C-alpha cells in the first residue's frame, strides 16, 4: 500500500495513509472513510486549529462531491478556486470509500500551508449534520479534532534484529508515586554479573496500563566508570536519604518523552554498555506529573533495551545541546514568539571532538508547555553551514527521536547554535528555565558517531550581566536606588513589571552579553579551561532557502 | 491614448507611457524606441540597481531577471505579457502588460509610492541574455509613481482662468544640474481666488532635461530676476503654491477646497524655480518650460491648507551607523487633534514625504482608539531625489482624538557615525507634509523623544558597558551621540528607548507659539494591534 499510516478520529472511521517522494517533491495522500455520515473534512494547519486551515472537503449532500477548501481566522469554510490538493483516484471497497489525492510540498500560493521538515498538524472533522454550501458548516454538528505527524519521513526501512539480539528490561520496582504534584524519581538497577560488553541497537518504552497518562519523561543513565556503586534503590531524586554518588551519572543510555515510539539504530553504530573499563549500574529517572493527586497509584515503568552481543562498526553517543537549567534564562509573559538561544562554542568542540569529527544521524527536540519552534544549526567561523534539525511546528505533546534525512558532519571548531521559540500568552508571569511544570527547557538530544566524552554542550547567560540588567531597568525606573539585592533570580523576574522597554532590553541582553559555557563529560565533570564569560558566538551570516469533482 | 508618460534615458531615444487598471489589477506599458540600436532592456528594481531586477528585453521579446551580480537570465515564468509591437513615425512601439504582483515572491511588487525603473540600451548584438556585458550597455534608472490614483478631471467653474508661469525662453547653462529662479507677477488689486488645478508645461525636446518644477509666493514684506538660484545677484519667497515632478499629469484640489491667492494678506510677487538635470551636458538648448495654474474667482467652500507631521528637528533623534533598516517615529497625539481640530474634523487629499539622503521607507498611518484604522500614505521605495506632492486615492478623514503616526526607515550602511536630527546634509529629517481641508490653525503637529529619558539612555548604556554592579556616586559625564561605542546592545536599547519613553509633543501654530497647555512628557501613543495587508491574488515572437 502506502508506507505511512495513522488513524484520525478515535472511532477510526477515518484513516489516513501517505507516501512521500523527494524526487517529485510531493506527498500522496490516501483517505479511507469507513462510515460516511453527512460529510467529512481533512487538511493541515499551523498549530492544528480549524482556523486559517488548508483543507479538502466531501459532502453527501447530493444523491457525493469532493472539493478543495480553505478556512479563515474565524473558522468559516470557503472553496479554493485554484487547487493545491489534486484529486487522483476514488474507489469504493468493503473497507469503505478511498480517495487518493496529491499535493506538492509547497506552492507559489502564499495562502497555502507549507510542508517542511519536522511536525505537521493535520486537522480532521466529521460534520454530523447535512449542511449546504460550505459556509453553513458550523461548530455545532462538527466533530473537529487534530492529529500530529511527521509528513516528511527519511524513507528508510527500519532495520531489525539478528539471531544474537537479546532483551533487557529496565523498570522501576513497583513503587508509590507521592501525592505531590510533581516527582522526579531515581532508581538503581544492575546488570547480570560477569556481563560482557554490548551494543544497544534498539529500545522502546514500557508504561503500566493505568499510568500512560502520568509518566511524561523517562531516562536511563550510566554513572562514572571509575566507581562501584550504591546498593539497590527506589525513590525520588531529591531527598538526601540518597547518597553521595549517583548525581554523577549524566551519561545517557536511553531517553523517552511524550509521542516517542520505539527507536532503531542506523547499522553503523550501537550504544556500548558493560565490559571492562566501562562500568556499573543503570540509573532510571522517571518524571511523574500528577494533577490527579489521589492515593498512591502503584507503578513499575521503564524502558526496554534490545542489544546485540558485540560490535557494529562504530560506537554511538548521545549529546545534549542547549540551555543549562537555570533561572537566569527567562521568557516574559504575553509573548507571541520569544526566542531563547544556547550554544556549543568552537572551543568546546575543538577540545572535545576528534579530527574526523562526528556524524549526527538523529535528533530529539525537547521543551515544556510553551514551546513552539525548535531549531539547531551548524556554523563555521561565523558562517552558517548546515541545518542540523528543524521543527517550526514543534509541539511538546509530540516529541520523537527522528532519524535525520541527511547525516550531518560536525568538526572541531564548529559552533552548534540551538534556538527555541516560546509562546507565553497564557501566562501572567515571567517563565523561567527550570525543572518545574511552570518552567521551561531548550534541549536537543543528538544521536551521533563515534562516541566521545562530550555529553552536555550547553550555555547560559552570565549571571552578573543579568544582575546589571535588573539594576539597569530598576534605575530606568528612575527614582535613585542604590540597591544591590542578590540572587532570587526567579524572585527578581516575577518582580519585574513587564513593559516594552524591559522586554526589548532583556532580548538585547540575550543577543549581546557573554555566556557561561557548560562543556561537561560523561563523568559529570567539566572539560578543564575557563568556560565562564565566553564571547557570544555571532553570525556574520544567514543561509537562504529558495472545480468540484464527484 | 496612454495618460501617463516619462522619459527614461537622457538622450530621449526611449520614452515610456502607461495606463492603469485597478479592476484588472495591472499596468499597461508602452515603450517607444526612437532610435533602435542592437537592443533595449526595461524593467524595475528596488532601489534602481541592475542587480536583482525584474526585466524585459528586445521582432523578439523576452521576460528576464537579473542575479546578485547583475547578469541577465531568461524568465521561465512571465509577469510581463507582450501585446503588440508596431512601427510608427515616432519609432518602434511595444505595448505590454504586467500585474501589480505575482505569486512568485522573487518578482517585484508594484504598490503605492515610488517605483525604480531600470533601462538599458544594448550597443552590441547579443545571442543570449547572459552574454550581456557592461561593454555595449548603456544603463540608467528613472524614479516614478506607477500606481497613480484614478482621478477624473473635474468640471471647471467656467469662471476658471489659467495663468502660465514659464521661463522667459532662456538658455540652459552647460552644467549637469541647474536650478533656475525667475520672477513673475500678477496684476495689482487682484483679490483672492482659489487654485483648483495645475499642470506642467514642458517645451518639446526638453522632456529629459526638466526634473522638477515649483511655484512659490514671496514674503509679503521682489525685484525682477531671471537666472540661477545660487547666482548671488535677497529672498526667501519660500512657501508653496505648486509643485511638479516627473510623471505627474495634473494636480486637482478636491470639490470642497482650493488654494487661496489674491489681495492681502497675500504677497504681491511670484517666484518660479525650475530644476534642470543635464547629464551629457547639452548646450545652447533653450527652454520655456514652467507650470500652468487653473484658478477661479468664486471660492469653493473651504480653504485648503498644509500641516507638518513628523519628528521635530533635534539632535536627540539619532540613527546608529551601519544599519540596513532603522526606524524613527514621530507622532500627532489624541490631545493635539482633540484640541486643534474642528468637531467635523479634517479631510486629507494629499501628501508629500520628506527626509534626507539616508531615507528609504516612509509611512503615515491613522490610529483610532489605539487601533490602526487606515494608511494615510505609504512609500517603501521612497527616495530623497524624487519627492513629489501626491494625491491620495482615497481622501482620508481625521477626527478629533485620532492619532497620526509617522515612521521613517533609514539606511546608514555608508556612515561611520551616528546620524542625528537636523537641517544639515549629514543629519536627518522625518516629515510628512499633509494637504487638507478645511484649513485650521494647526500647522506643525510633531514630536520628539523626551530629553531626560535620552539622558537616562546615555547614562544607562555608559554604566552598563562599563563593568560593575551596585555603586552609587554616579557622576554624569558624556551627554551626546557622537563618541558612542555602537554595539548590538546600545543599538537595541536605543530602539527600546524610542519605542518606550514618553515624548515631548509639539503642537504648534506660528513655529513661535504652542497650543493651549503643557505639552511636555506626553504619554507615548501605542497600538494594541495592526491592520491586514491585501493578498497578491493567485521567448515570444510577434509580427511587426
Ligand atoms: C535662446 O535663449 C537665449 C537666452 O534667453 C536668447 O537670448 C540670447 O542669449 C544669448 C546669451 O544669453 C545672447 O548672447 C549675447 O551675446 C554675447 C554672447 O554670449 C556668449 O556667447 C558665447 C557662447 O555662445 C560665449 O562663449 C561668449 O563668451 C559670450 O559670453 C554675450 O556677451 C552677451 O552678454 C549676450 O549673452 C543673445 O544676444 C540673445 N539673443 C538675443 C536676440 O538677444 C536667444 O535669443 C534664444 N534663441 C532663440 C532662437 O529663441
Ligand atoms: C449552527 O448551524 C446549524 C445549521 O446551520 C444550526 O443547527 C440547526 O439546524 C437545523 C437544520 O438546519 C435546524 O432545524 C430546523 O428545523 C425547522 C423545522 O421546523 C426548519 O424549518 C428550519 O429551517 C431548520 O431546518 C435547527 O433548528 C438548528 N438548531 C438550532 C436553531 O438550535 C445551529 O443552531 C447553528 N448554531 C450556531 C451557534 O450558529
Ligand atoms: C513651537 O513653539 C514653541 C514656542 O513656545 C517652541 O519652543 C521653543 O522654546 C525654546 C525655549 O526653551 C526657544 O528655543 C530655544 O531657546 C533656548 C533657550 O531656552 C535657546 O538656547 C535656543 O537657542 C532656542 O532658541 C523658543 O522659545 C522655541 N524655539 C523655537 C525654534 O521656536 C518650539 O520650538 C516650537 N516647535 C516647533 C516650531 O516645531
Ligand atoms: C557541569 O559541571 C559540573 C559537573 O557536574 C557541575 O557543577 C556543579 O553544579 C552543581 C549544581 O549547579 C553545584 O552544586 C556544584 O557545586 C557544581 N560543582 C562545581 C565543582 O562547580 C555543573 O552543574 C555541570 N553542568 C551541567 C551538568 O549542566
Ligand atoms: C506513492 O503511491 C503511488 C500510488 O499510490 C505510487 O504510484 C508511487 O510509486 C508511490 N511513491 C513512492 C512509494 O515513493
Ligand atoms: C487601459 O488599457 C487599454 C489601453 O490600450 C484600454 O483597453 C483600457 O480601456 C485602458 N483602461 C484605462 C482605465 O485606462
Ligand atoms: Cu524536561
Q: DSSP states of A481-529 as a string? A: --------HHHHHTTS---HHHHHHHHHHHHHS-EEEEEEETTS-BPSS
Per-residue DSSP letter, A421 = E
User: Residue B451 in 3-state DSSP?
Assistant: helix
Grid cell for residue B423 = 537641517
First to last CA, chain B: 20
Q: Do residues B469 and A464 make contact, with C-beta atoms less than 8 angstroms apart?
A: yes
Per-residue DSSP letter, A36 = -
Rounded to a whole number of angstroms, the CA Rg of chain B reads 25
β-partners of residue B259 are B195
CA distance B52 to A486: 54
Distances in Å between the Cα of A31 and the Cα atoms of A26, A77, A89, A127, B71 are 16, 20, 11, 16, 47
> Could you tell me how far CA B156 lies from the centroid of its own chain?
28
CA distance A224 to A453: 11
**Which residues line the pocket of ligand 4, CB cutoff 6 A?**
A 250, 324, 456, 458, 518, 520, 524-526
Phi then psi for residue A345, to 5 deg, are: -75, 160
What method was applied to determine this entry?
X-ray
> How much distance in Å is there from the Cα of A366 to the middle of ligand 7?
7
Helices B488-500, A500-512: axis angle to 10 degrees equals 170
CA distance A245 to A74: 56
**B353-367 residues labelled b (16+ CB within 10 A) or e (exposed):** bbbbebbbbbbbbbb
CA distance B380 to A208: 61
Ligand 6 atom closest to Cα of B150? 13
Measured over the CA atoms of residue A205, residue A209, residue A211 and residue A212, the dihedral's sign is positive
Interacting residues of A524 by C-beta distance below 8 A, sequence separation 6+: A224, A247, A248, A249, A250, A251
Resolution of the experimental model, in Å, one decimal: 2.9
Residue tagged 479563515 (cell numbers): A72
- From the list B456, B471, B496, which residue is nearest A505 (CB)? B496
CA distance A148 to A163: 35
* Region of B262 on the Ramachandran plot (φ > 0 left; ψ -120 to 50 alpha; else beta): left
C-alpha triplet B435, B437, B443: angle, nearest 5°? 60
Residue tagged 537549567 (cell numbers): A325
Nearest residue on chain B to A463, judged by CA atoms?
Answer: B469
Distances in Å between the Cα of B321 and the Cα atoms of B171, B298, B419, B481 are 43, 54, 7, 11
Closest listed residue to residue B162, CA positions, set B46, B242, B90: B242
**CB contact (8 A) between residue A508 and residue B497:** no
The string of DSSP codes covering B457-524 is HHHHHHHHHS--S----------SSTT----HHHHHHHHHHHHHS-EEEEEEETTTEE-SS--TTBPP
Architecture of domain B160-303: Sandwich (2.60)
CA distance B266 to B268: 6
* Residue A184 a catalytic site member: yes
Q: After which residues is chain A broken (C to N over 2.5 A)?
A: 63, 546
Interacting residues of A124 by C-beta distance below 8 A, sequence separation 6+: A8, A9, A14, A16, A40, A41, A42, A145, A146, A147
**Environment class of B168 (CB within 10 Å of its CB; exposed 0-12, middle 13-18, buried 19+):** exposed
Interacting residues of B122 by C-beta distance below 8 A, sequence separation 6+: B37, B38, B39, B40, B41, B132, B136, B137, B138
CA distance B182 to B166: 8
**CB contact (8 A) between residue A504 and residue B488:** no
User: Residue A474 in 3-state DSSP?
Assistant: helix
Grid cell for residue A407 = 547525516
Phi then psi for residue B290, to 5 deg, are: 175, -160
Is residue B520 within 6 Å of ligand 1 at its C-beta? no
Q: How many CB atoms lie within 10 A of CB B423?
A: 9
In chain B, DSSP finds a helix count (H) and a strand count (E) of 3, 38
Q: How many CB atoms lie within 10 A of CB A331?
A: 24
First to last CA, chain A: 24
Q: Which residues of B touch A (CB under 8 A)?
A: 103-105, 456, 460, 463-464, 467, 469-472, 487-489, 492-493, 495-497, 499-501, 535-536, 538
Q: Which residue is closest in CA terms to ligand 6's atom 9? A: B21
Residue tagged 494594541 (cell numbers): B528
A287 is in an annotated binding site: yes
Closest listed residue to residue B95, CA positions, set B25, B8, B26, B152: B26
Q: Do residues B363 and B327 make contact, with C-beta atoms less than 8 angstroms apart?
A: no
Q: Do residues A137 and A131 make contact, with C-beta atoms less than 8 angstroms apart?
A: yes
Parallel, antiparallel, or unpaired for β A175-176 and A298-299?
A: antiparallel
Q: Do residues A401 and A445 make contact, with C-beta atoms less than 8 angstroms apart?
A: yes
Per-residue DSSP letter, B454 = H
The string of DSSP codes covering B187-251 is -SS---EEEEEEEEE--TT-TTTEEEEEEEE--------EEETTS--------EEEEEETT---E
Amino acid at each position: 500500500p502506502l508506507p505511512y499510516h495513522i488513524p484520525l478520529d478515535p472511532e477510526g472511521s477515518l484513516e489516513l495513509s501517505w507516501n512521500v517522494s523527494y524526487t517529485q517533491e510531493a506527498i500522496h495522500f490516501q483517505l479511507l472513510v469507513r462510515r460516511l455520515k453527512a460529510g467529512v473534512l481533512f487538511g493541515m494547519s499551523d498549530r492544528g486549529e480549524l482556523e486559517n486551515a488548508d483543507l479538502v472537503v466531501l459532502w453527501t449532500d447530493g444523491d457525493a462531491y469532493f472539493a478543495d477548501a480553505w478556512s479563515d481566522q474565524k473558522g468559516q469554510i470557503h472553496l479554493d478556486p485554484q487547487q493545491d490538493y489534486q484529486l487522483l483516484q476514488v474507489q469504493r471497497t468493503p473497507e469503505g470509500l478511498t480517495l487518493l489525492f496529491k499535493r506538492p510540498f509547497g506552492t507559489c500560493d502564499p495562502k497555502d500551508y507549507l510542508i517542511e521538515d519536522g511536525t505537521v498538524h493535520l486537522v480532521y472533522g466529521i460534520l454530523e449534520e447535512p449542511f449546504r454550501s460550505l459556509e453553513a458548516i458550523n461548530g455545532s454538528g462538527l466533530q473537529m479534532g487534530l492529529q500530529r505527524v511527521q509528513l516528511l519521513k527519511p524513507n528508510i526501512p527500519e532495520p531489525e534484529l539478528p539471531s544474537d539480539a537479546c532483551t533487557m528490561e529496565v523498570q522501576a520496582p513497583n513503587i508509590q508515586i507521592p501525592s505531590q504534584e510533581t516527582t522526579y524519581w531515581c532508581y538503581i538497577k544492575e546488570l547480570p554479573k560477569g556481563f560482557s560488553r554490548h551494543h544497544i541497537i534498539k529500545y522502546e518504552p514500557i508504561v503500566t496500563k493505568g499510568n500512560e497518562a502520568l509518566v511524561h519523561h523517562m531516562e536511563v543513565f550510566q554513572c562514572a566508570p571509575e566507581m562501584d556503586s550504591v546498593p539497590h534503590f527506589s525513590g525520588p531524586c531529591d531527598s538526601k536519604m540518597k547518597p553521595d554518588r549517583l548525581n554523577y551519572c549524566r551519561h545517557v543510555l536511553a531517553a523517552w518523552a511524550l509521542g516517542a515510539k520505539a527507536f532503531y539504530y542506523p547499522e553503523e553504530a550501537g550504544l556500548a554498555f558493560g565490559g571492562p573499563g566501562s562500568s556499573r549500574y543503570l540509573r532510571l529517572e522517571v518524571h511523574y506529573h500528577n494533577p490527579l493527586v489521589i492515593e498512591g497509584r502503584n507503578d513499575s515503568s521503564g524502558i526496554r533495551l534490545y542489544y546485540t552481543a558485540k560490535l557494529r562498526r562504530f560506537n554511538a553517543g548521545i549529546m545534549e545541546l542547549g540551555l543549562v537549567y537555570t533561572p537566569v534564562m527567562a521568557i516574559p509573559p504575553r509573548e507571541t514568539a520569544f526566542i531563547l538561544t544556547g550554544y556549543c562554542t568552537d572551543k568546546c568542540t575543538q577540545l572535545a571532538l576528534p579530527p574526523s569529527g562526528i556524524h549526527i544521524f538523529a535528533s530529539q527536540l525537547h521543551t515544556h508547555l510553551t514551546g513552539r519552534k525548535v531549531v539547531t544549526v551548524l556554523v563555521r567561523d561565523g558562517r552558517e553551514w548546515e541545518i542540523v534539525n528543524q521543527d517550526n511546528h514543534y509541539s511538546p505533546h509530540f516529541q520523537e527521536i527522528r532519524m535525520l534525512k541527511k547525516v550531518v558532519s560536525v568538526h572541531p571548531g564548529d559552533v552548534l547554535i540551538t534556538s527555541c521559540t516560546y509562546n507565553t500568552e497564557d501566562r501572567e508571569l515571567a517563565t523561567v528555565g527550570g525543572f518545574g511544570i511552570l518552567e521551561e527547557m531548550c534541549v536537543n538530544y543528538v544521536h551521533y558517531y563515534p562516541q566521545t566524552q562530550l555529553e552536555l554542550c550547553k550555555s547560559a547567560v552570565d549571571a552578573g550581566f543579568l544582575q546589571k540588567y535588573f539594576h539597569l531597568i530598576n534605575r530606568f525606573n528612575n527614582e535613585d536606588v542604590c540597591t544591590c539585592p542578590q540572587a532570587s533570580v526567579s524572585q527578581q523576574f516575577t518582580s519585574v513589571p513587564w513593559n516594552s522597554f524591559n522586554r526589548d532590553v532583556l532580548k538585547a541582553l540575550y543577543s549581546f552579553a557573554p555566556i557561561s559555557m557548560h562543556c561537561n563529560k560523561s563523568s559529570a565533570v567539566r572539560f578543564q579551561g575557563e568556560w565562564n564569560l565566553q564571547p557570544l558566538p555571532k553570525v556574520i551570516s544567514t543561509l537562504e532557502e529558495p472545480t468540484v469533482v464527484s
